[PDB]
Amino acid sequence: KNPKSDKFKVKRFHHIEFWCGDATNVARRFSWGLGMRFSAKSDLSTGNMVHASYLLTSGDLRFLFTAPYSPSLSAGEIKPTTTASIPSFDHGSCRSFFSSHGLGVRAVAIEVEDAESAFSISVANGAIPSSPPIVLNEAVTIAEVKLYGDVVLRYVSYKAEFLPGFERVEDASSFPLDYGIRRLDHAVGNVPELGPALTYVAGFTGFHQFSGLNSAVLASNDEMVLLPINEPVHGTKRKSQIQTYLEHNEGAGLQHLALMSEDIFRTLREMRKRSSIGGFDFMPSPPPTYYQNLKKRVGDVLSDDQIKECEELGILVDRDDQGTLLQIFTKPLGDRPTIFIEIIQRVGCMMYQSGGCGGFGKGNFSELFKSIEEYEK
Template identity: 55%
Template sequence: MGLDAPSLKLVGHGQFKRVNPNSDLFKVIKFHHIDWWCSDATSTQRRFGWGLGMQLVAKSDLSTGNSTFASYALKSNDLVFSFTAPYSTKVEKSKESKSPIPWYKADMALNFIAAHGLGVRSVGVLVEDAAEAHQKATAHGAVSVVEPVTLRDEASGTEQVVSEVNLYGDVVLRFVSGSYQGPYLAGYTAVESPPLSYGIQRLDHAVGNVHDLEKAVNYIARATGFHEFAEFTAEDVGTVDSGLNSMVLASNNERVLLPVNEPTFGTRRKSQIQTFLEQNEGPGLQHLALKTDDIFSTMRELRKRSSQGGFDFMPRASDAYYKNLPAKIGDVLTPEQYKQVQELGLLVDKDDQGVLLQIFTQPLSDRPTVFLEIIQRIGCMHERAEPASAVPPVMEQAGGCGGFGKGNFSELFKSIEDYERLLDIN
């Protein structure tokens, strides 16, 4: 999608027709990492590691010669989170500071934290060529944040190219490429730590909230070539009290999914999206969907730790919701699985291709802003296109299989509205 391409227009779920034009401007492979900015990286990474089952794999801090910031990378299978916090700007920094991210500025990070609290700064995407991605994105209207920078890993002699463009608000889309095969970014020190995983496999999608939906998605689509994958209007997903409009953008291989939401108005209560925009002091990343292949096992581990420093989840749906689920979803799930769905407080939905099981955490910090979603997708298996010579063929699941929980939005919104009433937000 170039600058002269037709604009994307919100038409609603019923009128939308999915087409994949394979229009990416550069080769996109998958999500690479998420970089969270916070005021205390040590405590934050420990909570996420314990609460989600993620292993500490890399670090950069005073112990590695970095006097600018502390940063710790966690990993669970193909999911990588890093947590980065600035050191004091009042302490003179050594000229020999070994910062693996030379463009990081402590004062900028402090301003980000003051405005947003705990939040996602960078959505990292693995691409074939980060320099090319930056050049083509900026040529098609993207706002450059970091020109291509080459990072070198001294131990292996390999390199990594990183560049950034603005995504929305203070969130950036970070392109990563190169021969470096380490656990995070070149220049970080690898950490040996006990293996840890509760079954979370990878990042499925990253959702942003903005004031103007069509303006935001057209900016992203023109800068990347991503196509529209799905959309929902207030009529599709709202309750009597509040609602949203949403459009989902996807890469050619549909492994990078970027839903974007805007608030709707005229309802009895303020849209949850508007609450986010106010509490976050502008657009930002609302939630991350983390994919597991066994949500029952994963959620038993996560719920076990909810009262032990982990994460709290939104209240369970009504008894009527669970009573009606078998008729709605069918025999894809066994009676025992339906029982576990109710016990664990999961939501279930389906589209014409597959089934989605999902659950949402409560906000992760003091502000009612960013949260997590745990999901499992069932169905939509096909042979992987690359490598075509694989014998036997490698099977993989189509991106977005089972949708995004359209049939659960009303139940979810009611739960969020009840939660916000407890906080006296509206």
Template identity: 55%
Template sequence: MMNAHANLALAALAFPAHMPNSKSSHIRSRRTRRPLLPLTMAAHPPIRTNIGMSTHGSASGGGEQAGISSTDRFRMIDFHHVEFWCADAASAAARFSFGLGVPLAAESGLSTGNTAHASHLLHSRSGSLALLFSAPYAQGDAVTASVPSFDADAARRFTADHGLAVRAMAVRVPDAGEAFRTSVDAGARPSFAPAELGHGFELAEVQLYGDVVLRFVSHPDDTAIPFLPGFGSVPSSGATPDYGLTRFDHIVGDVPHLAPVAAYIAGFTGFHEFSRFTADQVGTAESSLNVVVLANNSENVLLTVVEPVHGTKRRSQVQTYLDHHGGPGVQHLAMASNDVLGTLRKIRGRSTMGGFELLPPPPASYYDDVRRRAGDVLSEAQIKGCQELGVRVDKDDHGGVVLQIFTKAAGDRPTLLLEFIQRIGCMDKDENGQEYQRGGCGGFGQGNVTELFKSIEDYEKSLDASARLAA
């Protein structure tokens, strides 16, 4: 069997070698660039790697390389944060904090000496989940920016072009400068050269797709800095409860052409193919899409790339995203919870008060099938809870179960969605006897992908005013 990189390389031959250009693809740095240093791993705990073949719900049997030492060109420790560029950071952050139960943890702006941008960081008390919202000031000094890659003019264009959208997907790495140089040497398009932020922090960026960048952040394990240097901590008042969201499980990007984008990302990261679904596997009678999920060696950083399929009865929901977003971008953020049913009840309780509205549930007959497929893992009370909330359920060949649900569009445009997910099972023990859950447990089950695709398609139909009037 060919390995994942060979599959991606062959797939890329079928399409033009095209990557969308970004309006802000030039390299910029306003701080001292670090000299070239060797990549040092000793100061960080070892990443647990999977032994043998990974076949988590993959229609193509991807992930073959996950157990072969390491396919990664450099180590990614985990997702670090996601940054939204927006017109008013305070309002956007307040809405997400209220709706998702993620407290405000740090800020940067005029009160901290930053005249370039206002930034508000939400950070879960239950885990590492971090959402950053940034907006430009009318006038300011770029040198004072706490996020050195921030560009006020580019942020204004970004917001006008894309609305509420993700600008940066950040991952923590042992050495941001080394990750940047390794990526660029392997074909990544540079966006922001490595910059030292002080206190052992470093930041760099490469282009991912469209106007989205992949941001590398490195910092000491024992740092007392709340987020990045230049951010001030916000004391916890207890006014904002924590709903139990822990981390980003995976992040999904919609693009016009999947193969060249997937090959580009796998090429500079060394990621392997975790899952793949094609139109005939996950589509509906009216529309469809193609999906590839890429993963790092430990499979805790999952990047999904999706393309539309044309020539179907309805326009693909991916094409709807591309049209309204104005090109490629992050289509949804999947956030994990260790008790997704409890988390969803709290989120649903605020959905009519300015929070986020969940997609409608599937028909009751769907949960009869859930009992057959996953009744040996989920209790009857859990299955009834899934039915009450509309949670989709799937189980892979290794006994891992995945619970998933989407919100309706998070903003005015039918673009950005939020997903909530819980992975159950796949427990293992490390060399010290400590129990942990293997990365990507339960995979991306074909049944869930189909059901979730259909639920979004039905939601889009509800937005089609011309169709409603005709009916």
């Protein structure tokens, strides 16, 4: 059931903003590791004396990397005279976030019809305000409310090129890398208590409900904005990875970003070639028994050659009533065992493809446990 209860008009995920200590080095590592192009910048070279922000893109996926300059460079400014291109940015908030959490997502940004209206309706319905609506160059409106922990949900609306004040990147610095990633599929939060988190977020958005953890997924009307949230389950044999996250992150935050690929075989071939030369590492692949069991689960969807290619690349597969899901997880993106990335591709639910086609892979918890036991043999 989908009661289509959004309290404002939501379109799609727009961008993800990482708060960094050095945006340059993180952005360059991510660009090479994920195959994303440098697309826009706002920094000293564009007149921004407050923060350095670099935008990477792959298809519709937009990753923004932001770090503060010395406050001394902008000491004479006030908010009405700021050279910051992102008006919600604050030196103290950014440094506090990074000191507390390390590298991680500060903002999950969605495009809405009217960010001013979205902000008002959200706060009227219980959202904790983080940054009020601000109109940039009479063209783009941005506002922010608290999502969980120190992560904000950022609303963006356009009257009619990322943000005013950002410059397109000189072609020579913009190498057209592309490993197949096309859009953000979902963004997952870890919280200490799932119940209150769900009630809060569903409360102010109207989003409906779509081992070691309990989870639920909030979704927009067309189920294209997908926001899973996890809480830990305590006392288990193996310690809850959600609890490990909360300890190393100093509390709630964004756990993983799932990036849809138009060709997950090519994406993973490209990413795995670069794992040891500056890119991202992947979690340990499942045993050969997992892929032998795949024939009985998805042999109608995937040929044996395609199943063999899943095995070459360490890809997991899950299936539900309506669609099939190919997925794989990176090791953590930075020093702490906190945020990681999922690469995903969905098969089915063709109407365009409906959002969440095939679910989120929860069947792979049991299929992996059983496959490792099967594999001790």
